[model samples]
Target chain A: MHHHHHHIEGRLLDVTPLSLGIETMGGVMTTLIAKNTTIPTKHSQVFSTAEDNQSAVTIHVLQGERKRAADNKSLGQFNLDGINPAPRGMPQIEVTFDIDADGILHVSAKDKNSGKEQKITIKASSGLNEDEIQKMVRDAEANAEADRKFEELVQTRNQGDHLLHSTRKQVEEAGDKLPADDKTAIESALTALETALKGEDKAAIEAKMQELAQVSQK
Target chain B: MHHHHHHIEGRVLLLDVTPLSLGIETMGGVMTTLIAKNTTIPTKHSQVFSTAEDNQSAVTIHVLQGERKRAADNKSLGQFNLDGINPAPRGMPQIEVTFDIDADGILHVSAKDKNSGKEQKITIKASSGLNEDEIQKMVRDAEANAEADRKFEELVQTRNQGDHLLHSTRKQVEEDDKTAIESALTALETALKGKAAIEAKMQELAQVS
Candidate 1:
């Protein structure tokens, strides 16, 4: 019934610049939202205390993709101040991450038993501030052509690096068992690939990687 | 055909994109992007790579954010190592890395060993440079500042009481006392609304006494 015509004129759009999560037991990062998730989104995860008779819980909100909580960036933390002491893991706390249309992250923690909530807006310590972001937007527009070229160059370089690493690892492991002639050929190709990495010509590096691949296959 | 109409629309809209390419460092610190820049938010991507050596039980993946091709050139957002991979031949066990960037540019990354079904998930906070302990310290400092503010307010209250005493005492003073205090009392009353006023009134009350 009328599902097709939902488009309204002049809708706003926004993007997230980083990822956010909470620190879990043993200093691990438990991701709540990934980078590039659309704005005006809401997500929540339920957590509990680690000990019996725990009356409060402090939730540390972090930003970054690293596996270790210590390695990531911390936005802030808020404590659910008052809760009835209960047995371990008995009290439920729900943490919510809400990103609005203005790209501001509002994090809140609510106690299910007490219905009390605490919240904070994530102010990234190292992320670009408003003025910096504005400057970046202008700079990007001014250097659009150069940026596109740079992006292409970066992609090609990444592929070349990946190929170099994978092939080198295979060759190193194949040592002692590889036939004499095949080993000689692979070594020469690896040397050529190493040299190709120092240059800017992506096709030259690709050609070297291909040479290595052919020798390894033989 | 000439009828006029007024339309009032109540709607909030937002458009966002990925700010940088998100990828993991493969063997030899090589960057491999799973998600490219300018992609729409709330997006997810996955890729599969194999272990570098035979019987390697663990793999360390360094997540990076940037436009540079080399892993070292880009910013290292964080690193997580997956453990408990089933022993297999070199490049045989598949490790799948899934990267997702939410609407607010936050990253959620996970890696799974397809063979053993073991998985790990992490959120990469690129912008927030501070860690948990540091943020906690900031919170503590903010709380301390609040306590200090409360103390300062008490001081102001005490000064107000002194001002009231001076006003009442002046009303009952002799004519000579009244002429001597009039100028100072006027100055104190004019400066009564600020931190400086508190100090000013306090000094004038003492001098008159």
Candidate 2:
């Protein structure tokens, strides 16, 4: 009868969609003003208010990653208050939203006809804030960079050493049939790459990579 | 000598940036609108634009992921040509975007800004189309549901075990008024937590010699 208290909130909810379109009860073709999309992306739609003197309207939000609103799960609801009472069916509701780095949702609703504003914040499962997620994203980005750099260094060293090793053998095997300058240039590039790889420095590694890439262009 | 066959010649670029944003970049340190944000657990940001000018302009499209434009590094660039220049900037840029599930850079941008108004697809990177306010809206709407459900579930689970343990041990400490209900409750909670810790240690030992 032990409980598992493993930071159950440790679950990752990295839901980021591409578009923000609406789905009515049913339609011949789903009218996709904004498409359902992934994270760090944005989309919008314009909804017309159907009543007069409507100062507030609640938006039923969903946590779905589908084209139709029905396909998505309803996340929660929020109110767009302080709206102007416009003529029935004449008021324009433009709800603009953006999800930040920490997967927290943010929104701003404006009555286009009247120019009023409504701002709110949406909390994700972990209740983690923007500062927290930003740190996570940066860590992710940095790790990815480190991995890529490490792989590049290994590949460069292996390829250069193997190529120079074989080419030198070839020249020794054949007296002068093959072009000397061609082989010599590659050998020169390999020498530089080997030297650069010896030191643990980003700038030097990058320079060697650039030089190798340029030589490979031929 | 074996020469490595490099794959090049106008191929695609390899990138990994999940969580995309789509919205308009407006004035006054604000992103007037947003569609799909990086959060929203499950979010979408789609819209259509009929390029204003007859011939297409540079269509200076920039994507961002923060409340403010100048701030936030989780943004990207998505700009391309709309064939058959009908007009200018806002004239005929009939474009729609889809950035679903993990930003990782691969995005779809469609346009039917001219003739027949048919949609054309192009790929864009992260942070080009979304606005700050809009991103915030979507992210908020996105994570609210899952969070609420999880919180309630954890609370109930924790309390249930506490109650069960307390029920059996209630009388043992009830005789002494010195130990109040709060103290009893704390004891039960601590006992349950200790049980879990012991079980974890046993499992760890099992994994070892």
Candidate 3:
């Protein structure tokens, strides 16, 4: 598809998309404009004011990657006070993050009811390092996998707890119906699981559960 | 290989999946997952999305597929603007984008205003990639040249497999005559009307076949 070609400064100029970040209403950092979306892209969002008689809203813009808002690199922020005071839910505030061809950042938050707005535009050569940004992307993916696994570990631990609790009562109820050796083996496996559950090791707990299953199944 | 006898019913059933995550782009450039990566095939997922602005009339739905945390990091599948949104305050509109991937792994996407009880919808009649004639010439010519070239024939072979699958779908339609199969037939026809969408559509019709 080599329809045509161009040259720049004795070399080819490869342009890439940039990232922009915004604070969510829930207080985490999120991409307002995704990286590599082409230039001159815009997005709009709205949030209610924080409280009744709250007189200001701030549009704090950031860039970079991390789970939290405060952790990212600051592009800039603007505060608009003297808001017409009312219940936060009673009025609406609109925010738009707009960027254009010259690589400037545009962000604004407006109280549509009060008709008061605050806007900021910066010629955004934020001294972002290519290697650093690349590193962050790798780190973010790695961190995400670890975070999900931790969640998996917690839920796995809960299931182990549930099975152990359910089995204890059932074992006692079957005491008179079971033979002696089977009871002894079942008790040993149960005790092993009881201790294993208290430990943080996922594999050991799983092994103990399987051991209990082998002994308990008639 | 010989097919000496005619068959009444055939054998071989496959249960498969799509390899990457399929989801939508969210505000501030994040990937909000719907159907997870490597999820069992022929599954349907629906997620509720809301407006960032009060009384906004439309929402942008850019569908993508990848495992990335960022939106542009993924491959764009398709996009649409779901307008005529029921104007409520921000975060109140129940706009849902539903993802349905048939066993063929071809994705069917639609956007609906849930509160309206199913209006303002866009089913993904996708325009595709391979975006040029040279690539088209490359893929289409692969089979004809491959016995001679015999090099990098995966693309050509898959197209052959998909071409064969077209027969099964047409044959199934011959027996069942359900509209669902016809819609799939139509979609498959659309995909190959049109090429490489074959891989996506082939998996889809295979489910019903």
Query: Each model's TM-score, in the order given?
Result: 0.30, 0.24, 0.31
lDDT of 2 by residue, B22-61 (tens): 5543222233235543243233456654442335432323
Q: Residue B132 of candidate 3: its Cα lDDT?
A: 34
lDDT tens digits, residue span A1-218, model 1 = 55776555434586665567888654556779976677788998898876557666767777655554565555554455557788656588888898877666677777776775656553222244557445544654666575455445556665666566667766775565766677678778888887886776767877887887777784
Tell me the fnat of candidate 2: 0.00
lDDT of 1 by residue, B1-209 (tens): 36767665432236576556677776434567788765766788988888755678767766765555444555555655566668886568888888876766566667788778877665544333323354355445545556454555455456546655555656556445466577776677666644655666777767776
Which stretch of 10 consecutive residues in model 2 chain A shows the poorest summed lDDT? Answer: A24-33
Scanning candidate 2 chain B in windows of ten residues, the lowest lDDT window is B67-76
Chain A TM-scores, one per candidate? 0.52, 0.38, 0.56
Tell me the TM-score that candidate 3 gets on chain A alone.
Answer: 0.56
DockQ of each: 0.02, 0.01, 0.01
User: lDDT per model, in order?
Assistant: 0.64, 0.44, 0.62
What tens-digit string does per-residue lDDT give for candidate 3 at A1-218?
A: 77797765422222333467666543456677776656566788777664447666655566665555555555554455556667534578887877676656667677776665656555433244678778777776778765455556656766776677667767775456766687678788888998987776789988999999888777
Cα-based lDDT at residue B179, candidate 2: 43
- Each candidate's number of clashing pairs is 42, 88, 6
